């Protein structure tokens, strides 16, 4: 420990550990304070907590007649905290999450349009109203969107004979020409508009099995105003009966430039499927997380093992089994939503070098999290409170300024501002 070879001037015996004392040698607490030194002149300018912004978690005191403004709801408390941090000394604080009953929900429906979803397409014709009706049990303000995708329109993923370039399928099969991504409907609350417009889409097809929905997910994530995302909870339903292309597959096609994570819509068409590689899983993780997109993988039985693995790599996702005729999507969505919304997962931002976080969770039934699990609580039903013990240390004095890193539950725009101020100078 600090008992061995360690001796310097002033602001260095300070930043050496918890124990090391110096009377105005740098060895221990219960050894320097065990030997003759007056606890008057001894130096210890230790670290403090200081809660600055802290609106109370909204309780339901005003009863069932209060239809509460989304902007009044407060799920996470504190909101702005200043933490004064000394070296080696953790400065821990608790954070209270409470699940509100009612929050506006944007849901985008992104679907495979290759020929095996012809059956599926014909069921989705009526989905707009039946899903609006259902979702409204859960939310007072629901908006719906629809987008389609098939594939990259290049050798070798589609066949490029002039015939198949216009009808990628057989003689009888009336497939439209292949496309990458089409925004059929940006977010509306007119579920019937969904119904008409979805029933005007024509089914397509392509060559290789896995499709290019990853090109699509990215655009849906990053083309804010063109999709119509409001700063509410955002659901992307991604439904398909095939696997997925991802970064690296683009090489085969000559595409070698990695996806830029930028919007490239024109007349509601992704234009650059020729030019950019499919995004990597990591890339999506970034842009989805950063755009608060909770993903619902609605995939068929035969691709469960895969999309389950995908699900574990995408924070704030969920997976469920789609029937071949897509008859069961609504239940799927509901189920996916319920599990999504009944588990909170806490994420922080970029720390600076000599600064580390630790998490401890305390959920219902006395189930307590630790380590990576310190930031998860599940089984949270409406109104439930959970707490988090967030614990931050430091090694030595880096930036003699401050860091405004935010702690945030994934899916929610609600944040917790945490201001670090490092104590370096002598006293």
């Amino acid at each position, epitope marked *: 420990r600090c008992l061995k070879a360690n001796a310097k001037s002033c602001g260095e015996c300070i930043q050496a550990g918890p124990n090391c004392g110096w009377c105005t040698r740098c060895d221990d607490l219960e050894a320097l304070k065990k030997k003759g030194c007056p606890p008057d002149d001894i130096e210890n300018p230790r670290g403090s907590k200081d809660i600055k912004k802290n609106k109370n978690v909204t309780n339901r005191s005003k*009863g*069932t*007649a209060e*239809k509460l403004k989304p902007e009044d709801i407060h799920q996470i408390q504190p909101q702005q905290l200043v933490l004064r941090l000394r070296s080696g000394e953790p400065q821990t604080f608790t954070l209270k999450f409470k699940r509100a*009953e*009612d929050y506006p929900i944007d849901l985008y429906y992104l679907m495979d349009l290759s020929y095996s979803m012809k059956d599926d397409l014909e069921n989705v014709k009526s989905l707009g109203t039946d899903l609006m*009706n259902e979702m409204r049990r859960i939310t007072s303000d629901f908006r719906i969107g629809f987008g389609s995708f098939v594939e990259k329109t290049v050798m070798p993923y589609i066949s490029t004979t002039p015939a198949k370039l216009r009808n990628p399928c057989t003689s009888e099969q009336n497939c439209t020409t292949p496309f990458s991504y089409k925004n059929v409907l940006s977010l509306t609350n007119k579920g019937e508009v969904f119904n008409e417009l979805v029933g005007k889409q024509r089914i397509s097809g392509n060559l290789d099995s896995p499709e290019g929905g990853f090109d699509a997910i990215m655009q849906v994530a990053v083309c804010g105003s063109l999709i119509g995302w409001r700063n509410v909870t955002r659901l992307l339903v991604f439904s398909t009966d095939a696997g997925f292309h991802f970064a690296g597959d683009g090489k085969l096609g000559g595409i070698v430039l990695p996806n830029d994570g930028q919007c490239h819509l024109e007349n509601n068409m992704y234009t650059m499927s020729h030019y950019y590689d499919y995004p990597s899983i990591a890339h999506l993780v970034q842009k989805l997380s950063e755009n608060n997109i909770q993903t619902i993988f609605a995939v068929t039985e035969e691709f469960q093992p895969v999309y389950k693995e995908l699900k574990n790599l995408i924070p704030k996702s969920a997976v469920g089994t789609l029937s071949a005729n897509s008859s069961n999507v609504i239940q799927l969505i509901i189920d996916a939503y319920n599990s999504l919304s009944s588990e909170v997962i806490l994420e922080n931002g970029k720390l600076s070098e000599g600064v580390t976080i630790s998490y401890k969770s305390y959920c219902k039934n006395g189930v307590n999290g630790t380590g990576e699990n310190g930031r998860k609580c599940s089984n949270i*039903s409406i109104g439930d409170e959970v707490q988090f013990e967030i614990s931050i240390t430091s090694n030595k004095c880096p930036k003699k300024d401050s860091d405004s890193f935010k702690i945030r539950p994934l899916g929610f725009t609600e944040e917790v501002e945490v201001i670090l101020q490092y104590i370096c100078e002598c006293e």
Partner: antibody
Amino acid sequence: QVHLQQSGAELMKPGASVKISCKATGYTFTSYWIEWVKQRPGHGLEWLGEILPGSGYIHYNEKFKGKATFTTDTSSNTAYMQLSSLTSEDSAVYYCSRALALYAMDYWGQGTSVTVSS
Amino acid sequence: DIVMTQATPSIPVTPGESVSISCRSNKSLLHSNGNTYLYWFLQRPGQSPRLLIFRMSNLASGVPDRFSGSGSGTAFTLRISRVEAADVGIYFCLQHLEYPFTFGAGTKLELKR
């Protein structure tokens, strides 16, 4: 399988007081208000009050202040209503149900008839 | 506070015909939400009330497409498309905006013969 099971039929004498129970299963008890409604044959339905199990939040219909008292037991997922100073006005069937601000009274109890006769 | 009027006490209807049932409110149930808070319940004889319509227009689960609800800000109607024997009962409206919550005295619905 969301279910509200209410206590059996009760025979009372004028001036007495009675406590009806409503046991909730199939959902987390502390997530929903329990709603209390009175039905007399000839006056239809009448909202009495609502209470939030975990809290101590009640909203009474003033007409019934000092007639109906609301309590819950979180450990046995049961809502209770107490009717006191029973008269012939209090003889009815009494329903508990369930509500959130956005979605009111989807599931109901089977009802409990309170008869006030000497 | 808020008064719900269901003027018609009962409506005899030949099975197969459609019916509108109306409810009025002395105050607009329209919230600043855009959500208007009127509910519809049906009580089959000797059974408890069942939710049919929530927030003016939306159907409760298990409720057939035959049932449809719409309305002004103060005048609302429930339309049943093909009245069966199972739709016989008392139809109550309910306001869920102001304490205390108020039902209209319901309208009974019976078969013509």
